[PDB]
Amino acid sequence: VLRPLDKLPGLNTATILLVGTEDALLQQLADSMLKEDCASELKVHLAKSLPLPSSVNRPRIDLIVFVVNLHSKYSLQNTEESLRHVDASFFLGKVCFLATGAGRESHCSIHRHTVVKLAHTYQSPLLYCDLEVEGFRATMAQRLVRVLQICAGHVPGVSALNLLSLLR
Amino acid sequence: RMTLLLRLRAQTKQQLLEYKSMVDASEEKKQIEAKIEDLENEIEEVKVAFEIK
Amino acid sequence: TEEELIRECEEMWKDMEECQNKLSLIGTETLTDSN
C-alpha cells in the first residue's frame, strides 16, 4: 500500500503518479506534463493498478491522479480496485481524479455522477478533462503540475492538506 | 546557486511542516453534518494562523 | 552565505528524516474502502 510520506522528498523533485488502465492517454498526459519548462523536476510516474509492484528506490509520490476513463467501465472498476491500496493520509491532498473521455458524453459507459460520487466519497479533487485531444491536455497537464507543486510543497504557502480545502 | 538554495529552503520549510503535521496527526488517537463544520472551522482558524504568518 | 543557510536547511532535513522514521514506525498503511 502506497504512503505519502514513507520516502523523503527530493530537492526540487515533484514526482506525480498517474494511475489509469489505458497507458496511451497516460503517456500523452505525461508528455504534456513535461512539455512546459517548469521550475520543478517533475518525475512523472505511470501505472495501471496502484498495487504498483514493490520496487525500492521509488521516489516520494507527491501526487496520484486516478485517470478514470469514463468511456470504459474497466478504468473505473480498476480504479476502485486501486483505491483499496492507498493511504487515508494520501487522499487528503495528494490524490486527484482525472475523468478523461467526459464531455464527449456519447461513449461514456460511466455516468459522470458515478465518478463524481467516487471522488467525493474519497474527499479528493476531481479534475475533468479529455486526454485524447492535445488542446485539452496541455491546459490540464499544467493544472496537474500546479497541483503537484502544491502537494509537493514547492509553493511555500500551501500544503497538500490545504489543497482539498480549496478544491472542495 | 543562492536563489536555487533559497528555493530549496522554502520547499523544505514546508515539506518539514507537512511531515510534522502528519507526525502530530498520528500522535493524536461522528456528526458528519458537523464533522465538516469543525473541519471548516480549521481552515478559518488555520487561515487566520498562516495568514498573519 | 550558502554555508549559513545550508546549516539550517540540513538541520531541518535531519528533522525531516526523524519525522519520516516516526512515520515509518506508525506504519499502519491504513486502508479505505467505499466508506
Binding site: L11, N12 | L4, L5, L8 | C9, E10
Partner: peptide, 13 residues
C-alpha cells in the same frame, strides 16, 4: 542521505 552537498552539489543545476 546527509543532503548538505551530497544532495545539493550532486544536482549542480
Amino acid at each position: 542521505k546527509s543532503f548538505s552537498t551530497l544532495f545539493l552539489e550532486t544536482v549542480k543545476r
